[PDB]
Amino acid sequence: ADVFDPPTQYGYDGKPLDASFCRTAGSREKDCRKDVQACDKKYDDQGRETACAKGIREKYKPAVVYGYDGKPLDLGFCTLAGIREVDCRKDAQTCDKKYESDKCLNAIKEKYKPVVDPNPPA
To answer: Which Cys-Cys disulphide bridges does the record give (predicted)?
Structure first.
């Protein structure tokens, strides 16, 4: 037997959940470097991401919209609203990590802005 399949054990293909992934985070690079060492087991027996691994990718997140499902589905946080789902769907990726998060948050607040008449003071 000369052919042996290469170890496909990574976290995102190419490399596992390591410091290099979090290096591009800058601020959260300091957090991840210690945190990655604290979470040692990393992966499930099946080779799936654990609850710990899922918390990691959420903090050191790239520019992608992920839902509670642990999947990159785009509707989860908007399906609760209804009509404003149209608005948040656009701005959602702006609240991705760092820079535009504050300004995107500002955009989301006016989506539910109370332009209604106040409750009767009795």
So the answer is: 22-32, 39-52, 78-88, 95-104
**Nearest alpha-carbon partner for 18 in 64, 48, 57:** 57
Please tell me the distance from the alpha carbon of residue 61 to that of residue 101, in angstroms, as a whole number.
Answer: 13
Token digits of residue 2: 């000369």
Angle between helical axes of 51-59 and 29-38 (0-180°, round to 10): 170
C-alpha span between 92 and 82 (Å, rounded): 15
Identify the H or E element spanning 13. Answer: none
Cβ neighbors of 24 (< 8 A, separation 6 or more) are 62
Cα–Cα dist 110/76, whole Å: 20
Elucidation method: NMR
